[PDB]
Amino acid sequence: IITX
Amino acid sequence: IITX
Amino acid sequence: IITX
Amino acid sequence: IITX
Amino acid sequence: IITX
Amino acid sequence: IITX
Amino acid sequence: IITX
Amino acid sequence: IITX
Amino acid sequence: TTVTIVRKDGRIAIAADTLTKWGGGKESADYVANHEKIIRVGDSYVAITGSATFKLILADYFASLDEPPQLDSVARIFCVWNTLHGALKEHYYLQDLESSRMDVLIANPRGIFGVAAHRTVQEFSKFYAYGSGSPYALGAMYAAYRAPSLDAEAVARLGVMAAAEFHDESGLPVQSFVMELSP
Amino acid sequence: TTVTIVRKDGRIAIAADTLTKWGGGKESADYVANHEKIIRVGDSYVAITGSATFKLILADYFASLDEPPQLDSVARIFCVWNTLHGALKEHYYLQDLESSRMDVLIANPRGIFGVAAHRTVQEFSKFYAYGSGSPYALGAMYAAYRAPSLDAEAVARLGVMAAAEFHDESGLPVQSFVMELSP
Amino acid sequence: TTVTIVRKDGRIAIAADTLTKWGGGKESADYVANHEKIIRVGDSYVAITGSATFKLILADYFASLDEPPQLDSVARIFCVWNTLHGALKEHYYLQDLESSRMDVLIANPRGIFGVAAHRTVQEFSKFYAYGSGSPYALGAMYAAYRAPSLDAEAVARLGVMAAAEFHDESGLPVQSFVMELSP
Amino acid sequence: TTVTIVRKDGRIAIAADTLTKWGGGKESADYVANHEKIIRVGDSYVAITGSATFKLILADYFASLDEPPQLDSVARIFCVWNTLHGALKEHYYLQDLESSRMDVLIANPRGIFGVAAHRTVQEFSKFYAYGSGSPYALGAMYAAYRAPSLDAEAVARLGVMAAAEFHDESGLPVQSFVMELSP
Amino acid sequence: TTVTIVRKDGRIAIAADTLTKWGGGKESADYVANHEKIIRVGDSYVAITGSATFKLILADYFASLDEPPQLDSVARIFCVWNTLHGALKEHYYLQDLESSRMDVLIANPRGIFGVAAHRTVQEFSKFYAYGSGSPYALGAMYAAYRAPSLDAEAVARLGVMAAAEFHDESGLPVQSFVMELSP
Amino acid sequence: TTVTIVRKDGRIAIAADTLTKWGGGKESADYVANHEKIIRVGDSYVAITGSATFKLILADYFASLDEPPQLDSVARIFCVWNTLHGALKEHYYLQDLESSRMDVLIANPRGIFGVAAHRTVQEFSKFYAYGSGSPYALGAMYAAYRAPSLDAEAVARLGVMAAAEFHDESGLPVQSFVMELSP
Amino acid sequence: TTVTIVRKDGRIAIAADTLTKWGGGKESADYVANHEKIIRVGDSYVAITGSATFKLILADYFASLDEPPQLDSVARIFCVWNTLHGALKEHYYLQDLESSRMDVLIANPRGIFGVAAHRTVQEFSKFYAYGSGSPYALGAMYAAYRAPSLDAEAVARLGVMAAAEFHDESGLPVQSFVMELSP
Amino acid sequence: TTVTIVRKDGRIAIAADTLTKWGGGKESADYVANHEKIIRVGDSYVAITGSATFKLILADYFASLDEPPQLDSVARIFCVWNTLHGALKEHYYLQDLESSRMDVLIANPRGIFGVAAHRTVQEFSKFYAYGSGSPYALGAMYAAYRAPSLDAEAVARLGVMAAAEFHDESGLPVQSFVMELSP
Amino acid sequence: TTVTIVRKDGRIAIAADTLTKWGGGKESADYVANHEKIIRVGDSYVAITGSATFKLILADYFASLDEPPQLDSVARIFCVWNTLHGALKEHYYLQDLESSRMDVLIANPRGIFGVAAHRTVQEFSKFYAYGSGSPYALGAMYAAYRAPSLDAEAVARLGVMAAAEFHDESGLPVQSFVMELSP
Amino acid sequence: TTVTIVRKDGRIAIAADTLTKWGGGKESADYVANHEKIIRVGDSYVAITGSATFKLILADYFASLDEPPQLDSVARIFCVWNTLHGALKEHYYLQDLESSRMDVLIANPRGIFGVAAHRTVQEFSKFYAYGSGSPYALGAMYAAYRAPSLDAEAVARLGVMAAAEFHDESGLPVQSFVMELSP
Amino acid sequence: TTVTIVRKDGRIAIAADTLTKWGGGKESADYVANHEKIIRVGDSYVAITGSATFKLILADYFASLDEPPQLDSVARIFCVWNTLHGALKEHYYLQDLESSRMDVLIANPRGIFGVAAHRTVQEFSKFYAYGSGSPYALGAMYAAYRAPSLDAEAVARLGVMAAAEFHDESGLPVQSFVMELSP
C-alpha cells in the first residue's frame, strides 16, 4: 500500500 | 413485539 | 434478584 | 430447540 | 463447579 | 469434528 | 500458509 | 522484546 | 403464554391462557376481543405460542389450502409443517435447522401432538405444555393427572391456572376444548 | 406520539396528539401545518405512530389501490397489512417476523382495531392506546371510561392529554374524530 | 412496583401495590405474608421501589438511630439520605453521582416528598408516582385528581390500580394510608 | 436443585431433592453419602440452593457462633444474613446489592421463610420453592395444596417430585422434615 | 443422547437411550410416545443424535427415494450422506466442510458403521458410541466387551445404561436391536 | 488426568494415570521420573488433578504443618481445604466462590472422599473419578463394580485404563494403592 | 496426524500414523477398521492430513475422473489441485488465496512432493512431513537420514513414531509404503 | 523473502533468496528442490514475494496466453497486471483497491520495474528491493552501489545476503540473473 | 530457543542454541558476544528459555544469595523457584497459578531436571527439551538416544541442531556441557 | 502527497511533490523514474493524491475514451467523475455516498478545480491544496499569495515546499506546470 | 530514529540521526536546537531511541547520582538499568517483564553495548543498530564493515545515512563520536  |  |  |  |  |  |  |  | 394438552380416560382436551403481552404491558381478555390462542383447523385444535401474529398467519394459511390438512400422525404433521415453513418465509415475512419461531400443541380425536419451533413433532401419551408458563403447568398436571375426579379438561385447565398464578406472561381466563378419543 | 381509541355507548372515537419530534427538537402544530397523525381511508380513520414518513406512505399507498380496502374485521385488516408490508419493502424503501415499524389504531363504524409493528391485529372491546405516551393514556382512560358524563370522544382525548401532560414525545392540541357504531 | 402519593383538600395519602417479582415469577400477597412496601418512620410513611431488600434495610437502619429523623423538608430529607447512602455502602453491601438504587415517596403531615435513586429530593404539590407502573398511575391520577367525590386516598389508590391493570410488575391488593395535613 | 416449604393444618414441612450436578454429570444419592441439602441450625431447618459448598460453609459458620441464631422472624433472619454475608467474604472466599449466591428456605415451628441471594427475606403464608426446579414444584403444590388428604409434608415432597420428573437438575430421593406449628 | 453399536461373536447390535431434552427440561419415554431414536432403513438400523427433528427428516427422506439405499460399505454410506446433505439444505431447511449436524450409527448384517457430522464415515471393528453420553458408554463397553457371558446386545445396552447413570442428557429405558452377522 | 477411588468388600483403593501433558505434548512415565499423581499425607492418599505444580505444593504445604491433618470426615477435610486455600494465595501464587483449581480424591481407612475446586467436599459410597478422563472411568467402574472377581483395586485401575484407552489426557501405566477399611 | 515422505538410495517411501481424533477422544486403529490415511491414486500414494472426511472425498473424486491423473511433476500436481479445489466447493461442501484445508504428501516413482492447503506444491529432495506431529518427525528424520543402516522406509516410519511418542494427535501403528525410484 | 533488482553500467541484474517459510518452520533449498523464486516470462525475469503458490500461478497463467506479454514499460505492465488480477479471482481462487497479494520485481533488457500488491507499477532508476527483507537489502545496496568493483549482479546479490544475515524470513543460497541493458 | 538435556551411560549433558531474536530480526553469536543461554549456579548448569533478560536476572539473583542453592532434588528446586518468583516480582519487575515466564533445564551430577513457567518441576529419566524448538529436538533425540556411538553430549547437541535446521527461532553454534553422574 | 493549484494575474499553475511512500519507507524521485503525480488529459493537468495506482488508472481510462473529456466546468467535471467511478468499480477493482478514494486538482486555461473522494467538485478562486501535506501548503500560500514578486507558479511550488519541509509524506523535488488563463 | 555502534581496528564509534517526529510532522535539526540523541555519562556515550523525553530523563537521573555509573560490563549495565527502571516509575511517571520503553546503545573504551526496553543487555562484537531505521543501517554496515578504507566512525555514520535515505523516521545530519579501544 503505496501512497502519493 | 406482541406475544402469546 | 427479587424486586418491588 | 429439542435434542436426542 | 458442583451445584445443588 | 473428526481429524487426522 | 507457505510464504516466500 | 528480545527472546532466547 | 401457557398452552396445555391432555389425554385421559377416552377424552382429549386442550387449553390456553388469554393474556397478551407487549413488553411489560398486559393486554387482558377484558380489553382484547380476539384473545383466543387456539384455532380450529379441520377437526383439530391448534394452540399457539410465540408472536401473536402467528394465530392469524396460520388461520390465513390453512384457509388458503385446497382442503384442510390431516394432522393426525407424526409423519403427517411433519410434512404439513415443513411445507408451512417455506410459506412463512415466502408469503409471511419470517426471517442448526431454521426456526419456525412458534411452538404449538395439536389436539384431534386420533391423538395429542406438539410441534416445536425446529419442527420437532412429538406425540404425547398423557399430557404436555408449551409456552413460557409451561413448567408450572407440567407440575400441576403431574400432581393432578391421576386424580380420579378430574377429567382431561379439568387437568388441562389446571395447568394453565397454575401458570397464570405464578408467571407474568400468563393470564386468566382459560380457554379450553374437549373431544372424544376415536376408536 | 400518543394515539387512542375508544368504543362506548354506541359511539366510536379516535384521537392523537400533534407533536413531531426530531431528536430532542420539538416541532409543535404551531410550526408544522401538516401535523395531523390520523388519516382517512375509506370510512376508516387510521392513527399512526412511528416515523412521520408513514403518514405519507400510507396515504400514497392506499390512494394507489383500485378501491380503498375493507378494514372492518381482524382477518381483513391482516391481509391488507401483509400485502402492505411487501409494498413498503418493494416501493417505499423499508429495510422473528419482519417489522413494519409502525403501530396504528383503526376506527370505523363496525369496530375498533389495532395493528402493531409485527402485524398483530387486535380488536378492542373498550379502549386502547399506542405510541410512547400510551401507558399514561391507558391509565387516564381506565379512570374515566365508566364516567357517565364522558362520551367516547371525551375519553379518547383525555388519554392524549394525560400523555402530553407527562411525557416529552406528546404534545397538544389533540386531534380527534367520532362516529356512530353501526347496527 | 407502583407507589403513589397525593395531597388534596387538607389530606395526604400514600399507596402501593403488593406484588413481588422474581424474574417473570410472581409472588403475590396471597403467598407472601410480608408483602407491604410502605414502612413507618417516625410519623412519616415511606413507600419503596427497587429491590425488595431495601424495605428491610431501611427499617433496620432507621431503627438503629438515636431517634427517628425529621423527614419534613427537602433539605432535611436530603441530609438524611446522603448519610444513609454511606451506610448502605459501609454496612449493607450496596456496590455521575453514585446511585442508592431505590426510589421512595415520603408522606407526613407537613408535606409530600420523593427521593429518587441519585438523591434528588422533590416536594410535590398535588400528586406523583414512582416505580415501573408509574406512568399508568400518573395518567389515572391526572384524570381523577379534580373529581370532587374522590378524596386524596381514593386518588392514590386509583393510581396503583391503574398500574396493576396494565403492567406486569404491579399487583393488587393496594395498601394505603391517609393523614390530615398539619396547619 | 429444588427445595420446597409448606405450612398447612398446624404443620410445617420442608423438602429437597438429593441430586448433585457437576456440569451435565449426575452425582446421585446412590454415589454420594453426604447428599442432604438441608441442614439443622438450632430448631430451624435450612434448605440450600447454589453451590454445594454452601451446605458446609453454613454448617461451619453457624457452629462457630456462641449460640445458634434465632431465625423466627423476618427482621431477625435479615440480621443473621447481613452478618453472614460479611463472613462469607472475609473467611470463606466469596467474591445493585452484593449477592450471597445462594437461595435458602428456612422452616421452624414459628413460621416458614426464605432468603434469596440479595438478602431479600420473605415470610410465606402457604408454600414456596427455590432452586432451578422451582416452577415445576410451585405448580404441583398449587394443584395439591387444598387436597384434604395431603398433609404439609406430602405437599412439600410432591413439589420436589414434580421437579425431578421434568427437570435435569433435580433428582430423587426426596429428603424432607416436618414439625408442628407452635402455639 | 447415547447411541451404541457392537459387533461380537457373529452378532451385531445397536442401542439408544429414549430421553428427549428441551433445555434442562426432560421429556422421558413415559410422556413421549414416539421416543425411539433408531429408525429402520432397508435392512439397516440407524441410530440418531442431534436435533430430534432429524429422526423425522431421515425417515421422510429415505422414504422418498426410489428404493432404500445400500448402507453396507464405507464408500457407499459416504455417497448416500453427501447427497443427503444437499437435500437437508434444499428441502429441510438446514443452514472447513459444512456440517450435517447429526451423528449416526448404522448397523446391518454386513457391518457396523458411523457417520459423524462432517460426513466422516467410519467402519468399526468392535464397538463404538456417539452422543454426549458417549464416553461413559465407551468405558462401560471397554470393561464388558470380553466378558464371555455378555452377547453383543447386552454390551450395547450396557453402554447406554452407563450413560444414563451419570449424564443428564440420557435416560432409560434403552431401545435396542440385534441381528446375525452375514457370511 | 484420570484419578479414581473405590470402596468395596472391606477394602479401599485409589488409582491414577501417569501421563503429563504440556499442550498436545505428551510427557509419559517413561520420560518423567516423578510421574506419580498420588501423594501420601498421614495415612491418607491424595490423588491430584489440575496443574502438575499442585503435587509439589501440597507436599510442601502439608510437610510444613505441625502434624499432618485429619482427612477422615467431610467437615474435617473442609477446614483443612479452606485454610489451604488461603495459603495457596498467600505463599504459592494462586490467583461465585474462588477456585482452588484442583480436584482431588482422598482415600484412607475411615472412608473415601473428594474435594472439588470450589471446596465442595463429598464422601463417596461406592466409587468415583475426577479428571478429564473421569466419565470413561465412571462407565467402566459402573460395569465392573459388582463383578465378584474384581476387588476394589482392580476396579479402581480399570477405571484409569478405560480413560487411557479413549482419551488423550490419560496414559498408562496406572499407579494404585489399596488398604483395609477400618472397623 | 503425522505423515512423512522420504527419498533415499533409489527408494521412495511414505508413512502415516493411524489415530483418529474426535476432540480429546481417541479412535485408535484397534477400534476403527478404515484407519488408513494414505490412499492410492494411479501409481501415486497420497497421505492426507486434515479432516478425516478428505480421505473419502479424494477417493470418490479421483475415482470419478476419466483416468487417474498424473501427479509426477510440480506443474501437473498444481493443475490437478486447482481443479480439485473447485470440485471440493461445488460437489463436496467445502466453505489471501482460498484454502483447500488439507495438507498432503504425494509419493510416486518419479519423485516426492507435497501440497499444502493453499495449493503450494513443493518437490522435496530428501524428506519432509506434514500434520501436527510434523516437527517431531522432521527432527527424528534429520537425525536418522544419513544412517547407513536405515532405508527410506525405516526413516519415514521413524518420523511417525517420534511424533506418536510425544504428541497427542498421532498414534501407532504406522502405515507405510515403499517403491523403487524410476530410471 | 527478499528480492532485489539493480541497473548499473549497462547491465541489469535480479536476485532472490531461496528460503520458504511455513510459520516459524524453515524449508531451505537443501530440502526443497523447487526453491527458485524467480521465473522467466518471455525475455523478462519475474521475482516474486508473497505466498509460494503465486510462483506456480503466474507460470501457469503466462504459459496459457497466446504469446508471452510485453513487460517493458510501465503502462504495459499495468495492463498485464490488471488483467491478471481478474484471472487470479476467476481461475485461481484469490479472495481501497483490491489486492493481488504479491509484490514482484521485473527485469528485462529495456529496464527494471516493480509491481506492488495494489498494482502500483514503478520503474526504478538504480536499484530496489521487495519482500520482508527489503530494508536490509536497501541499506546494503545503498552502501555498495557506487563501489566501482561491484557490477550490477554483485550488488543485487549483496542485498539478498544482507537480508539473510539479519532476518528470519530470508535464507541463502541466493539465486540471481544478469543481462545487458539494450540500446 | 532450543535447550536440551540428556542423561546416558553415567554422563549428563546440557545444550542450547545461541541465536537471539528481536522480532523477525536475528542476532546471531557472530554479532552478540554474550550469546550463551546456559549459566552456572553452584555445580549446576541452568539453560534458559524466554526473554533474554532472564539470563541476567538469574545470574544477579543467585549471586546475591548467601551461598548458591542446592538444585539436586525436585522438592529443593521447587522451593528455590517458589522464592525466586517472589523476587522476580519484588526486585526485577515481572508482572491459575502466576507464571515465572521462563522454562529452564537444570543439570547437575545428582540428576537432570526441568522447571516450567508455572513452577512445575520435573525430573527426567533419559532426555528432554524446552523452548520453541523443542519438538524438533525431542524427535531427533528420540531417534539417536539408543545409538551406541553417541554419548550424552552428542545427543544433547543433536537435539539443538535439529531445531536450528528447521525452526526460525534457533540458530547455530550450539553451546553444551557435560559432567559425570554421581554415585 | 501534497498537490497545489493557484490562479493569479492571468496565469494558472499546478504543482506536486514527488515522494512515494510504502509504509514508513520512502521512495524518492532519485530511485523512482516515474515519480510524476500530475498527468495531462486533453489541455488539463490532473494532480493526484491517494494510492499511486490511480495515476496509471486514470491515464489508461482517459486514453480509452473516444476523445478526451471536457474538464472546464463544475457540472462537466462532475459527469466525467460520476462515470469514472462506475468504471473504477467495473474495470479497475475499486471496492453515505461511495468513495472514489482519490482527491485531485485539475488545472486548465478555463479555471482551477478540485474533485474530492466523494465526488465533490469545487471551483477555486485563488488557490487550494489536497493531500496530507495540504494544510502546510495552504498556510504558505496564504502568506505568499499577495506577494507582488511571486507569480502563480512560484506560489504553487512554495506550497509544496512547505509541506515537504514539515511533513513525512511529502518530498522534493517539486514538479509544476503553468499556463495562461483564457479570455 | 536510527542509532548505530561499531567497533573496528582499535576504535569504537557511535552515531545517531537528528530528526524528531511528532506524528507525521518532522522537526529537523534545522528547527530544533537540542536535536542531539547521544548523551555523555561518565566516559560513556549513550544513544537513545524512544520518546524524546528519555534524553532529558536520563541526563537528569544520571546527574543526580553520587558519581556517574560504570557502564563497561554486561552485569554492571544490567544493575544500573534495573535501578533506573524503578526510578522511571517512582520519579518520572513511566507507566511479561515491565518495559523501560527505550532502547539504547552504549559506547565506551572498554566495549560496545546495548540495552533494549526489557533490560536485555548485550555486548556486541562488531556492530549493531537500534531504532526503527535499524535494519537499513544493519544492511549498510554489513556491506561496509570489512572495507579497509572505512574506519569505525565511517561505518557507524553510513548506517545512519542509509536509514535516513529510505525511512521516514530518520533524518540527516548525523551526529557521531569516536574513541580508542582501551588495552
Numbering used by the authors:
A (entry chain b), B (entry chain e), C (entry chain a), D (entry chain f), E (entry chain g), F (entry chain g), ...: 2 to 5
I (entry chain E), J (entry chain D), K (entry chain A), L (entry chain G), M (entry chain F), N (entry chain F), ...: 1 to 95, 103 to 190
From the study:
The second hitherto unknown bacterial proteasome family member was primarily found in Betaproteobacteria, hence its name BPH, short for Betaproteobacterial proteasome homologue. Unique structural features, however, like an elongated inner pore loop with a highly acidic sequence, distinguish BPH from its relatives.
To ascertain the functional nature of the BPH active site, we covalently modified it with the proteasome-specific inhibitor epoxomicin. This compound features an epoxyketone electrophilic trap, the warhead, which renders it highly selective toward the catalytic Thr-1 of proteasome-like proteins. Additionally, we obtained co-crystals of Td-BPH with bound epoxomicin diffracting to 2.95 Å, whose structure could be solved on the basis of the apo Td-BPH coordinates. In particular, the modification of Td-BPH Thr-1 by the epoxomicin warhead confirms this residue as the active nucleophile in the catalytic reaction cycle. Further, an interesting peculiarity of the inhibitor-bound structure concerns the pore loop. Although the central portion of this loop is unresolved in the ligand-free Td-BPH structure, a mostly continuous electron density is observed for the whole loop in the bound structure, allowing to approximately trace its backbone. It is therefore conceivable that the loop contributes to substrate recognition, adopting a well-defined conformation and forming specific interactions with yet to be identified native substrates.
